[PDB]
Amino acid sequence: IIGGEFTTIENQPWFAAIYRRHRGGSVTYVCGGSLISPCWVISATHCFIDYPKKEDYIVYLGRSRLNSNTQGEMKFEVENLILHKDYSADTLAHHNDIALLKIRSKEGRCAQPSRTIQTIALPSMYNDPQFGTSCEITGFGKEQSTDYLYPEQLKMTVVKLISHRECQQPHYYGSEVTTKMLCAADPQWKTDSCQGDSGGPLVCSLQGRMTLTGIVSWGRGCALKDKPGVYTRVSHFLPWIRSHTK
Ligand SMILES: N=C(N)c1ccc2cc(NC(=O)Nc3ccccc3)ccc2c1
Asked: Catalytic site residues?
């Protein structure tokens, strides 16, 4: 997250921190995710497509720092890694950038909700917020495009949704951004999501309900003029999510 503010997991309790174990024992941070039900985390296929082995991943819920075992956190392995079959990547645009992770503790249990571990509601079909609505993003991603390290403490920011007609303007993304994608940015271009925030949540309060409207997917640079963040429009994928979690 470029700009924004430092936060803690009690403010983002649906946030999942996903890591990968490498041969030799080293563990590195991969992507964010969101808890949609006790046994299921939703994220972005691009986070996993190059290492599609469920045994490699570690998922934490209730974790506020990259390298602290936060009090109340719970650690899980991935029982099933579901990637979208029509996922693809263009120079900028990522298509069907959505994945599901079925989680299990060593004792075989799913998440136990608590003050720091909670689900986030899915949207309803054909009901996304109007352009100009403010939404929040959360993640352990870069603080500046030139950084190589990720922040130790979790961050959040707030951005505004941009219409498809505006996002398709020539100086924006033209025809590269589709109706299955949602744009969101800062009007002054000072805050945004960035590398390492992928898979994380774009949460919008709509009709009084905190909703998982988007999943961080792609963008040209981070916080660049006329280059919004692009998110998987979760409402389009409700049939896919429902069928893959039954
Ligand atoms: N402007 C944004 N909101 C945004 C959102 C997600 C992003 C994700 C990025 N991920 C990215 O470039 N990943 C990568 C890693 C190794 C080799 C090649 C590429 C980079 C910029 C991003 C920028």
From this structure: 46 (charge relay system), 97 (charge relay system), 198 (charge relay system)
The CATH number of the domain covering residues in 13-119+236-246: 2.40.10.10
Which residue in the block uniquely carries the two structure tokens 């997917």?
A: 217
Atom of ligand 1 nearest to the CA of 192: 3
Question: What's the CATH superfamily of 1-12+120-235?
Answer: Trypsin-like serine proteases (2.40.10.10)
d(C-alpha 172, C-alpha 98), whole Å: 23
What are the two backbone dihedrals, phi and then psi, of residue 121, each rounded to the nearest 5 degrees? -70, 145
Pocket test for ligand 1, best of 198, 215, 226 (most atoms within 8 A of CB): 198
Rounded to whole angstroms, what are the CA distances from 17 to 74, 92, 182, 202, 226?
Answer: 11, 25, 23, 15, 30
| CA atoms of 139 and 156, how far apart (whole Å) | 6
**Residue 97 CB–ligand 1 contact under 6 Å:** no
CA distances (Å), 123 to each of 25, 205, 229, 245, in order? 39, 10, 20, 16
Q: Is 198 in the pocket of ligand 1 (CB under 6 A)?
A: yes
E strand or H helix that includes residue 239: helix 238-245
Experimental structure resolution, Å: 1.6
* Deposited experimental method: X-ray
